[PDB]
Design a protein around this ligand. Sequence first.
Ligand SMILES: O=S(=O)(O)O[C@H]1[C@@H](O)[C@@H](CO)O[C@@H](O[C@H]2[C@H](O)[C@@H](O)[C@H](O)O[C@@H]2CO)[C@@H]1O
Ligand SMILES: O=S(=O)(O)O[C@H]1[C@@H](O)[C@@H](CO)O[C@@H](O[C@H]2[C@H](O)[C@@H](O)[C@H](O)O[C@@H]2CO)[C@@H]1O
Lengths: 160, 160
Amino acid sequence: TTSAVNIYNISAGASVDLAAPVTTGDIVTFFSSALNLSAGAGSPNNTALNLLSENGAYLLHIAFRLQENVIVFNSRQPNAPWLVEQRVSNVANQFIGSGGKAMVTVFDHGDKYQVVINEKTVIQYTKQISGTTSSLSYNSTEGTSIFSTVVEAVTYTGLA
Amino acid sequence: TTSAVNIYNISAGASVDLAAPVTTGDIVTFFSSALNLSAGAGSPNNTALNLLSENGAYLLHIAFRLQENVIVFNSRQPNAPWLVEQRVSNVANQFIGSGGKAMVTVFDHGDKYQVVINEKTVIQYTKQISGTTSSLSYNSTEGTSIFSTVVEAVTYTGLA
Ligand SMILES: O=S(=O)(O)O[C@H]1[C@@H](O)[C@@H](CO)O[C@@H](O[C@H]2[C@H](O)[C@@H](O)[C@H](O)O[C@@H]2CO)[C@@H]1O
Ligand SMILES: O=S(=O)(O)O[C@H]1[C@@H](O)[C@@H](CO)O[C@@H](O[C@H]2[C@H](O)[C@@H](O)[C@H](O)O[C@@H]2CO)[C@@H]1O
């Protein structure tokens, strides 16, 4: 009845507090104005996108590792070790059909997180930790990020 | 469970067939890489965005008229006159907080269409005609469109 759109500019190395939290049924899309599939090696993550809970837990962690040619999805409670991680091989293969820019979409299916790169679904992630997303972060390895220094994020909340 | 993201490049003067139709609960966002709030007068519409049914009906018509400083929302069946139109005054006032670009979002609330410009909801439109959206069009008055010649459209379907 009263859905909402919120726009955020996220500089590399930062985290932003969402004006409106993301919960079951809502969406989050990240827009990158550049694509560098051959920029270098990450220590270990070239670029990471994170969905965080109000408690500081990493609901969803998305990491792109060029040197290891893989994409990692994991979670963890604050001050706790990294949990069971799911990985997807072939980075470039996922960005086929980009052309100087990319977008990553995350659907919050309540009990799962659907991750989409452009138009291709790369994985149906099962939530290891539950809860609403209240902040987002974009971290990088200095100079080897595969996305622009500033990444735009649009959230669609108050849906279903 | 299996939502989908589809990306389209819509050149001014064209209409594109959606690979995935837009129905109750789905979303459509238009991205413009430019904003010209002082480009000229439309004959009468400077730029119009349309959601069309498989039968050619204009489910939702969105028109920006600089000379008349208003935004019109209407509908109509094919080969029929224009129906009851809703208008919103003050064009620029809606794009406050743009900065060289804009985005228009349309939420299909089943019995209504919620139109958002950037983060501001401009109107809750009551459907005069129902049905799923199968194609979209971007029409302009030669040389006086307030959006870029090519407008990007992203649809989020198969949601609720
Ligand atoms: O920047 S970090 O968040 O600290 O990077 C860590 C994360 O990317 C997690 C993701 O689960 O992985 C850590 O590396 C793991 C590696 O994926 C795993 O294969 C290996 O067995 O253990 C490493 C250390 O936990 C990143 O360091
Ligand atoms: O390019 S058109 O689609 O033919 O432009 C028409 C539309 O913008 C409709 C929107 O309902 O309006 C038409 O003009 C109206 C005008 O807004 C209204 O005030 C007057 O009563 O009737 C006109 C003709 O229906 C546009 O021509």
